[PDB]
Tab-separated table of C-alpha atoms in Angstrom:
chain	number	residue	atom	x	y	z
A	1014	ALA	CA	0.306	6.624	-15.619
A	1015	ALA	CA	-2.575	5.543	-17.855
A	1016	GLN	CA	-5.210	2.897	-17.078
A	1017	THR	CA	-7.020	1.941	-20.265
A	1018	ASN	CA	-10.662	0.848	-20.265
A	1019	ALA	CA	-11.146	2.365	-16.836
A	1020	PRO	CA	-14.553	2.851	-15.207
A	1021	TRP	CA	-16.089	6.031	-16.571
A	1022	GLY	CA	-15.829	7.847	-13.238
A	1023	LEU	CA	-12.071	7.379	-13.000
A	1024	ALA	CA	-11.655	8.605	-16.564
A	1025	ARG	CA	-13.912	11.552	-15.735
A	1026	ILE	CA	-11.858	12.712	-12.753
A	1027	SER	CA	-8.735	13.025	-14.919
A	1028	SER	CA	-10.451	14.655	-17.907
A	1029	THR	CA	-11.572	18.082	-19.059
A	1030	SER	CA	-14.340	16.333	-21.052
A	1031	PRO	CA	-16.883	13.550	-20.576
A	1032	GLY	CA	-16.892	10.563	-22.877
A	1033	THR	CA	-13.386	9.138	-22.471
A	1034	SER	CA	-12.321	5.827	-20.953
A	1035	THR	CA	-8.664	6.145	-19.852
A	1036	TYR	CA	-7.723	7.240	-16.324
A	1037	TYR	CA	-4.522	9.311	-16.073
A	1038	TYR	CA	-2.794	9.870	-12.746
A	1039	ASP	CA	0.590	10.393	-11.129
A	1040	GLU	CA	2.209	7.042	-10.303
A	1041	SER	CA	2.624	8.039	-6.638
A	1042	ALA	CA	-1.048	6.952	-6.475
A	1043	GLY	CA	-1.689	7.948	-2.853
A	1044	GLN	CA	1.263	5.975	-1.477
A	1045	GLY	CA	1.865	6.957	2.142
A	1046	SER	CA	-1.699	8.203	2.699
A	1047	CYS	CA	-4.520	6.423	4.497
A	1048	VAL	CA	-8.278	6.416	3.896
A	1049	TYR	CA	-10.777	5.252	6.496
A	1050	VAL	CA	-13.983	3.856	4.993
A	1051	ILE	CA	-16.664	4.220	7.666
A	1052	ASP	CA	-19.392	1.912	6.413
A	1053	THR	CA	-20.547	-1.747	6.404
A	1054	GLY	CA	-16.949	-3.021	6.422
A	1055	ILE	CA	-14.485	-4.022	3.708
A	1056	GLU	CA	-13.795	-7.469	2.255
A	1057	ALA	CA	-10.059	-6.975	2.668
A	1058	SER	CA	-9.287	-10.385	1.105
A	1059	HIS	CA	-10.560	-9.182	-2.277
A	1060	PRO	CA	-7.655	-9.513	-4.767
A	1061	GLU	CA	-8.402	-5.954	-5.903
A	1062	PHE	CA	-7.084	-4.573	-2.581
A	1063	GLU	CA	-3.675	-6.280	-2.867
A	1064	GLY	CA	-3.156	-6.516	0.894
A	1065	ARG	CA	-3.610	-2.746	1.350
A	1066	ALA	CA	-7.007	-3.005	3.075
A	1067	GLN	CA	-7.729	-4.065	6.639
A	1068	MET	CA	-10.570	-3.868	9.122
A	1069	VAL	CA	-9.619	-1.882	12.212
A	1070	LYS	CA	-12.918	-1.600	14.112
A	1071	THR	CA	-16.415	-3.014	14.259
A	1072	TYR	CA	-19.383	-2.400	16.550
A	1073	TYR	CA	-21.098	-5.683	15.552
A	1074	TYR	CA	-20.477	-9.428	15.853
A	1075	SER	CA	-18.159	-9.416	12.839
A	1076	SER	CA	-15.904	-6.984	11.043
A	1077	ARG	CA	-16.789	-8.654	7.744
A	1078	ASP	CA	-18.814	-6.777	5.145
A	1079	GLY	CA	-21.954	-8.880	4.848
A	1080	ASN	CA	-23.588	-6.232	2.644
A	1081	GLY	CA	-21.195	-5.096	-0.105
A	1082	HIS	CA	-21.721	-1.337	0.170
A	1083	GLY	CA	-18.543	-0.670	2.164
A	1084	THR	CA	-16.488	-2.929	-0.098
A	1085	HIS	CA	-17.779	-1.057	-3.154
A	1086	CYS	CA	-16.932	2.342	-1.669
A	1087	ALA	CA	-13.483	1.132	-0.571
A	1088	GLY	CA	-12.886	-0.142	-4.094
A	1089	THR	CA	-13.578	3.305	-5.541
A	1090	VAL	CA	-11.132	4.863	-3.072
A	1091	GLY	CA	-8.258	2.496	-3.614
A	1092	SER	CA	-8.687	-0.787	-5.471
A	1093	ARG	CA	-6.170	-1.579	-8.205
A	1094	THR	CA	-8.721	-1.468	-11.058
A	1095	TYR	CA	-11.635	0.532	-9.664
A	1096	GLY	CA	-9.834	2.986	-7.383
A	1097	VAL	CA	-8.726	6.600	-7.574
A	1098	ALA	CA	-5.725	6.237	-5.207
A	1099	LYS	CA	-4.361	2.839	-6.143
A	1100	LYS	CA	-1.561	2.726	-3.535
A	1101	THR	CA	-3.330	4.176	-0.478
A	1102	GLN	CA	-3.845	2.160	2.697
A	1103	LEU	CA	-7.512	1.421	3.422
A	1104	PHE	CA	-8.872	1.075	6.969
A	1105	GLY	CA	-12.398	-0.214	7.513
A	1106	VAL	CA	-14.610	0.925	10.393
A	1107	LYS	CA	-17.890	-1.015	10.494
A	1108	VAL	CA	-20.536	1.342	11.876
A	1109	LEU	CA	-23.324	-0.065	9.664
A	1110	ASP	CA	-24.808	-3.539	10.024
A	1111	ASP	CA	-25.126	-6.002	7.168
A	1112	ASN	CA	-28.480	-4.481	6.190
A	1113	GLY	CA	-26.720	-1.132	5.737
A	1114	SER	CA	-28.295	0.454	8.829
A	1115	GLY	CA	-26.707	2.000	11.885
A	1116	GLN	CA	-27.594	4.041	14.940
A	1117	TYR	CA	-26.305	7.608	15.054
A	1118	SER	CA	-24.649	6.867	18.406
A	1119	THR	CA	-22.565	4.123	16.769
A	1120	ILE	CA	-21.715	6.335	13.794
A	1121	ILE	CA	-20.570	9.107	16.166
A	1122	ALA	CA	-18.420	6.629	18.083
A	1123	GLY	CA	-16.865	5.506	14.805
A	1124	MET	CA	-15.935	9.054	13.823
A	1125	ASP	CA	-14.341	9.738	17.194
A	1126	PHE	CA	-12.567	6.385	16.838
A	1127	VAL	CA	-10.952	7.497	13.565
A	1128	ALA	CA	-9.835	10.821	15.041
A	1129	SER	CA	-7.858	8.899	17.665
A	1130	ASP	CA	-6.968	5.758	15.713
A	1131	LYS	CA	-5.031	7.672	13.072
A	1132	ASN	CA	-2.384	8.155	15.785
A	1133	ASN	CA	-1.909	4.362	15.691
A	1134	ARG	CA	-1.323	4.257	11.922
A	1135	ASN	CA	1.478	5.268	9.574
A	1136	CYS	CA	0.101	7.910	7.209
A	1137	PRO	CA	2.971	10.328	6.544
A	1138	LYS	CA	1.169	11.886	3.574
A	1139	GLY	CA	-2.106	12.398	5.451
A	1140	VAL	CA	-5.426	10.904	6.481
A	1141	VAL	CA	-8.853	10.902	4.811
A	1142	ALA	CA	-12.212	9.559	5.952
A	1143	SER	CA	-14.998	8.594	3.556
A	1144	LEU	CA	-18.568	8.582	4.947
A	1145	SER	CA	-21.067	7.183	2.433
A	1146	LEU	CA	-23.922	7.359	4.921
A	1147	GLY	CA	-26.388	9.739	6.482
A	1148	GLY	CA	-29.846	10.371	7.845
A	1149	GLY	CA	-31.929	13.283	9.056
A	1150	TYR	CA	-30.421	16.414	10.561
A	1151	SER	CA	-28.569	15.871	13.836
A	1152	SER	CA	-26.375	18.484	15.481
A	1153	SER	CA	-24.526	15.714	17.337
A	1154	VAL	CA	-23.702	13.855	14.110
A	1155	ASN	CA	-22.542	17.084	12.470
A	1156	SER	CA	-20.399	17.927	15.494
A	1157	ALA	CA	-18.740	14.509	15.352
A	1158	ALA	CA	-17.873	15.048	11.685
A	1159	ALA	CA	-16.563	18.511	12.544
A	1160	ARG	CA	-14.351	17.058	15.287
A	1161	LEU	CA	-12.965	14.431	12.927
A	1162	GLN	CA	-12.112	17.135	10.389
A	1163	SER	CA	-10.640	19.407	13.083
A	1164	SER	CA	-8.393	16.551	14.247
A	1165	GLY	CA	-6.557	16.566	10.907
A	1166	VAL	CA	-8.607	14.193	8.740
A	1167	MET	CA	-10.012	15.165	5.348
A	1168	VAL	CA	-13.678	14.226	5.820
A	1169	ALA	CA	-15.752	13.525	2.700
A	1170	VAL	CA	-19.462	12.830	3.194
A	1171	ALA	CA	-22.295	11.869	0.879
A	1172	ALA	CA	-24.853	14.578	0.139
A	1173	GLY	CA	-27.702	12.045	0.178
A	1174	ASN	CA	-30.046	10.494	-2.371
A	1175	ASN	CA	-33.326	12.354	-1.765
A	1176	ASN	CA	-33.219	14.838	-4.685
A	1177	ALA	CA	-33.587	17.439	-1.939
A	1178	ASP	CA	-31.635	20.158	-0.169
A	1179	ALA	CA	-28.843	18.511	1.826
A	1180	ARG	CA	-29.274	21.085	4.625
A	1181	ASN	CA	-31.776	18.660	6.211
A	1182	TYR	CA	-29.406	15.677	6.358
A	1183	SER	CA	-26.394	14.738	8.471
A	1184	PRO	CA	-23.449	14.659	8.274
A	1185	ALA	CA	-24.097	16.191	4.804
A	1186	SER	CA	-25.152	19.517	6.347
A	1187	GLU	CA	-21.995	20.008	8.449
A	1188	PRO	CA	-20.275	23.064	6.904
A	1189	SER	CA	-16.682	22.158	7.774
A	1190	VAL	CA	-16.554	18.785	5.957
A	1191	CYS	CA	-16.587	18.081	2.208
A	1192	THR	CA	-20.150	17.324	1.085
A	1193	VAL	CA	-20.282	15.409	-2.204
A	1194	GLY	CA	-23.096	15.303	-4.766
A	1195	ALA	CA	-23.349	12.826	-7.644
A	1196	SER	CA	-23.141	13.189	-11.433
A	1197	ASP	CA	-23.580	10.817	-14.379
A	1198	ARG	CA	-21.451	9.951	-17.406
A	1199	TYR	CA	-23.097	12.694	-19.494
A	1200	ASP	CA	-22.248	15.381	-16.912
A	1201	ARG	CA	-25.819	15.587	-15.615
A	1202	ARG	CA	-26.673	15.855	-11.946
A	1203	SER	CA	-27.629	12.349	-10.902
A	1204	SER	CA	-31.404	12.035	-10.678
A	1205	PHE	CA	-31.312	11.211	-6.942
A	1206	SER	CA	-28.510	13.564	-5.873
A	1207	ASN	CA	-29.201	16.029	-3.117
A	1208	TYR	CA	-28.210	19.638	-3.789
A	1209	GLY	CA	-28.006	22.969	-1.981
A	1210	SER	CA	-25.532	25.525	-0.708
A	1211	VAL	CA	-23.906	23.001	1.646
A	1212	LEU	CA	-22.522	20.919	-1.236
A	1213	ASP	CA	-18.844	21.503	-1.942
A	1214	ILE	CA	-18.255	19.320	-5.000
A	1215	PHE	CA	-19.743	16.703	-7.319
A	1216	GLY	CA	-18.202	13.372	-8.225
A	1217	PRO	CA	-19.209	10.415	-10.418
A	1218	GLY	CA	-22.148	8.638	-8.828
A	1219	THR	CA	-24.369	6.982	-11.465
A	1220	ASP	CA	-23.474	3.468	-12.695
A	1221	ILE	CA	-20.156	3.118	-10.865
A	1222	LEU	CA	-18.309	-0.189	-11.248
A	1223	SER	CA	-16.346	-1.314	-8.183
A	1224	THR	CA	-15.557	-4.265	-5.933
A	1225	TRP	CA	-18.230	-6.322	-4.191
A	1226	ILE	CA	-18.257	-9.086	-1.608
A	1227	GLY	CA	-17.517	-12.651	-2.616
A	1228	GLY	CA	-14.527	-11.434	-4.613
A	1229	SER	CA	-16.865	-9.955	-7.226
A	1230	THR	CA	-17.686	-6.616	-8.890
A	1231	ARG	CA	-20.837	-4.698	-9.719
A	1232	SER	CA	-22.095	-1.312	-10.852
A	1233	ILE	CA	-24.364	0.659	-8.488
A	1234	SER	CA	-25.408	4.298	-8.083
A	1235	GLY	CA	-25.564	6.846	-5.289
A	1236	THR	CA	-23.938	9.782	-3.621
A	1237	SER	CA	-22.301	6.923	-1.691
A	1238	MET	CA	-20.355	6.226	-4.899
A	1239	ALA	CA	-19.403	9.849	-5.557
A	1240	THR	CA	-18.000	10.346	-2.047
A	1241	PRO	CA	-15.131	7.810	-2.341
A	1242	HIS	CA	-14.054	9.369	-5.654
A	1243	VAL	CA	-13.481	12.601	-3.729
A	1244	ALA	CA	-11.903	10.822	-0.739
A	1245	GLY	CA	-9.493	8.984	-3.027
A	1246	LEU	CA	-8.752	12.190	-4.914
A	1247	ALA	CA	-7.901	13.935	-1.640
A	1248	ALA	CA	-5.517	11.131	-0.642
A	1249	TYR	CA	-3.895	11.285	-4.085
A	1250	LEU	CA	-3.451	15.073	-3.922
A	1251	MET	CA	-2.112	14.932	-0.355
A	1252	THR	CA	0.484	12.352	-1.403
A	1253	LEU	CA	1.525	14.729	-4.192
A	1254	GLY	CA	1.986	17.462	-1.576
A	1255	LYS	CA	-0.489	19.759	-3.323
A	1256	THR	CA	-2.816	20.178	-0.335
A	1257	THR	CA	-3.451	19.110	3.270
A	1258	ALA	CA	-6.324	17.502	5.154
A	1259	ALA	CA	-7.540	20.904	6.362
A	1260	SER	CA	-7.403	22.489	2.902
A	1261	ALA	CA	-8.142	19.616	0.492
A	1262	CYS	CA	-11.881	20.226	0.051
A	1263	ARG	CA	-11.221	23.861	-0.848
A	1264	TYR	CA	-8.352	22.852	-3.142
A	1265	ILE	CA	-10.546	20.306	-4.917
A	1266	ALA	CA	-13.188	22.998	-5.414
A	1267	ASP	CA	-10.491	25.480	-6.590
A	1268	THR	CA	-9.214	23.037	-9.206
A	1269	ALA	CA	-12.523	21.451	-10.234
A	1270	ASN	CA	-14.034	21.441	-13.689
A	1271	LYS	CA	-16.396	24.421	-13.466
A	1272	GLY	CA	-19.781	24.983	-15.060
A	1273	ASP	CA	-19.867	21.666	-16.920
A	1274	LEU	CA	-22.776	19.903	-15.170
A	1275	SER	CA	-26.413	20.162	-16.203
A	1276	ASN	CA	-29.482	20.358	-13.958
A	1277	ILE	CA	-27.587	22.037	-11.110
A	1278	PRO	CA	-30.159	24.103	-9.169
A	1279	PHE	CA	-29.520	27.805	-8.822
A	1280	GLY	CA	-27.422	28.293	-5.689
A	1281	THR	CA	-25.633	24.906	-5.804
A	1282	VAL	CA	-21.994	24.790	-6.908
A	1283	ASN	CA	-21.340	23.605	-10.458
A	1284	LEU	CA	-18.013	21.924	-9.708
A	1285	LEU	CA	-16.850	18.448	-10.741
A	1286	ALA	CA	-13.854	16.805	-9.057
A	1287	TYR	CA	-10.767	16.844	-11.266
A	1288	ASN	CA	-7.187	15.751	-10.600
A	1289	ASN	CA	-5.586	18.266	-13.018
A	1290	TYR	CA	-3.024	15.631	-13.941
A	1291	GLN	CA	-0.949	16.494	-17.003
A	1292	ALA	CA	0.574	13.290	-18.381
C-alpha cells in the first residue's frame, strides 16, 4: 500500500533515503495487534482513530486526554493518516495528568496494569506498549518496564529530551526495553535527543504531524514522537509474523537503516527504524 503526501516520518520509515513523501507498507497494517499508549490519555472519538482506540484505565478524575500529548503519540502509532500501524487496536492508560505530569508510583502501577490487562484483550498478533515519558534514574521504574517487557509486551520508551546521556533517565536506561532517540527530516540527530549506549534505535522526532485533542492535528517535536513510530513499527512487524514482542527491538535494530544519521556521538548506535517493505 502507498499513502501519498504522508507525514515525513512515515515516509522515512519506509525509505532507504530521506526526502520522500509517500509511506509504503503492507496492507495488513498491524491488524490483530494491540498497542498500549501509556500517557495523558487518548481522544478516542477523534475520526482519525476510526473506532480502534479506547481508554482502558485512568488514575485521575477522567480518562479523557485534557493535554493532547497522548492523543498525538497514539496518532503516530495507529491513526489512519498519521499512523504507522493503521489497523492496530489502541488502548489508552492515563498515568499522566492534563499538565503532562505524573508520579513514578502511578507510572509503575500503569505498567503493571498493562502486563496483566493484555490478558483481557484480543491481540493474536502481539502486544506493544509505548511510553513517551520519563524522569530521573529510578531502579523501581526501570524494573517495572523490565517486568512489562518480560510479560510478553514489546516496550518502547523515549530516550528523553535533555541532549544528554540517557543512562541517567528512566525508563530510558532500562537495558531490556527498546530505548528510542529522535531524528529530523534531514537525517540529523534531533537537537534535544538524548544519546548513549542504552539507546537501541532512532525514529522520526522533529516536526511530527499527528492527531490532537478537539478533533484537530498539529506538529510537535520530541523523543515522545519518535517512540510511537517504533511502537507502531513493532506492531506492524509482529502482525507480519517477522518478529515477536521479545525479539522486536533487536529485529528493528537488525533491519534498520545503518550509518545514515549525522551528529550521532561516538558510542551511540547509528540506526534508523525502517520497515524494509518492498512494494
